[PDB]
């Protein structure tokens, strides 16, 4: 239901999908791959869902820019349909 | 301190403005324009700033996309410093 992402530690992109994993309880086999999360947003996760992105700045210059794209892909479940609400502090 | 935009009102790009102008309380001579909202949110504007946008997929298809360059100029603001906060509800 709640998920927290601190860009203070999103050191790499695969912190990002380590701390989703967890955060979002996705699936064992998690493939961390902006597919594998588009895939368990539209049938695994349980939502309504709110996601807080603490200092989404770090987590996206620390990361070569490769947040921004995670984040369209929730920003985009949420077009298609899924309850989901961002909060990016 | 708080602002609450609802795509399910904006039917236009300048309806956009007209609510922005209230809800974040800009001049009177607010120019309606990117570059008039950059400057009120480099000086007027009053952080810190909880933005909420309801439904932000309405409010971006019924204007043309032209949602996306406003809530950048936000993101913008964030990242040169301002302290806001968005939810994109």
Redesign the interface.
């Known amino acids: 239901k709640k998920a927290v992402i601190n860009g203070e530690q999103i050191r790499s992109i695969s912190d990002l999908h380590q701390t989703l994993k967890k955060e979002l309880a996705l699936p064992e086999y998690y493939g961390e791959n902006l597919d594998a999360l588009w895939d368990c947003l539209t049938g695994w996760v349980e939502y309504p869902l709110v996601l807080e992105w603490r200092q989404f700045?770090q987590s996206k210059q620390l990361t070569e820019n490769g947040a921004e794209s995670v984040l369209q892909v929730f920003?985009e479940a949420?077009?298609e349909g899924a309850d989901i609400?961002?909060?990016?502090?």
Do not use: D
């Open positions: 700045e920003r949420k077009a609400t961002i909060i990016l502090s």
